[PDB]
């Protein structure tokens, strides 16, 4: 009969977020990165509101809720950006925000052209794999539950159950033919491979933003409060190996 989980994910999916970028100023490293940082700060508000509205999320210990959001935001935001880029510009450009679309020139000026190329490839995967909106939403929800401390969470048992349930929801919505069991298996394989592929991209961006925050005063790049806190307190836990992604495949 009529489900519920998908209804919820569709209902809570964040709307359009603008970066507040002044497209009159030249495309300088300082201007572009300061705008991406502000976009991050703005999107973080929406990620928190989204996560708190997810089925079961409030069952986690409050400190664990904070922790998973602070570790997973980069992956979540990149994955969502890849989808926007796919749907809006067929992955030709990176659609960070309606007022902050990166073309080749901006990719170069941002000094993260290589990372942008990887993000474009991620975006293109949505087309190559013909990912459905429902597959996208379930995959994105699972990204929230895909990075934790090596030492575990305060209530790891509840987390493990929640993650299991999100994996089950993804399995249920995969676009495949049940009459051909091999198709469903191949599809699930492809999707878990796609999910895993987000992590190395997020890692490169974690390294970049950390290095940027350290030199931010020297290169005139502004970091808002929440971003500067998370990049200085949580991101280094990832970079130092205290916090690691949960991969499907070895």
């Amino acid at each position: 009969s009529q489900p519920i989980f998908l209804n919820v994910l569709e209902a809570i999916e964040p709307g359009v977020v603008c970066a507040g970028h002044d497209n009159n100023q030249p495309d300088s490293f300082a201007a572009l990165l300061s705008s991406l940082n502000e976009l991050g700060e703005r999107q973080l508000v929406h990620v928190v509101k989204w996560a708190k509205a997810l089925p079961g999320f409030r069952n986690l210990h409050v400190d664990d809720q904070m922790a998973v959001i602070q570790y997973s935001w980069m992956g979540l935001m990149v994955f969502a950006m890849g989808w926007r880029s796919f749907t809006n510009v067929n992955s030709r450009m990176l659609y960070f925000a309606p007022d902050l679309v990166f073309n080749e020139y901006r990719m170069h000026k941002s000094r993260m052209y290589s990372q942008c190329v990887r993000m474009r490839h991620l975006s293109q995967e949505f087309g190559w794999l013909q990912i459905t909106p429902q597959e996208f939403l379930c995959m994105k929800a699972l990204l929230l539950f895909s990075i934790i401390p090596v030492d575990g969470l305060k209530n790891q048992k509840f987390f493990d159950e929640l993650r299991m349930n999100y994996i089950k929801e993804l399995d249920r919505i995969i676009a495949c033919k049940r009459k051909n069991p091999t198709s469903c298996s191949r599809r699930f394989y492809q999707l878990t491979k796609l999910l895993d592929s987000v992590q190395p991209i997020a890692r490169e961006l974690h390294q970049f933003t950390f290095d940027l925050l350290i030199k931010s005063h020297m290169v005139s790049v502004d970091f808002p409060e929440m971003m500067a806190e998370i990049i200085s307190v949580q991101v280094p836990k990832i970079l130092s190996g205290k916090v690691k992604p949960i991969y499907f495949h070895t």
């Binding site: 973080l44 508000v45 928190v48 708190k52 409030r58 409050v62 904070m66 959001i69 806190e229 307190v233």
Partner: peptide, 12 residues
Amino acid sequence: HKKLLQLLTCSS
């Protein structure tokens, strides 16, 4: 940490 946790405390 203030603004971030504030987004969780508000209407918990």
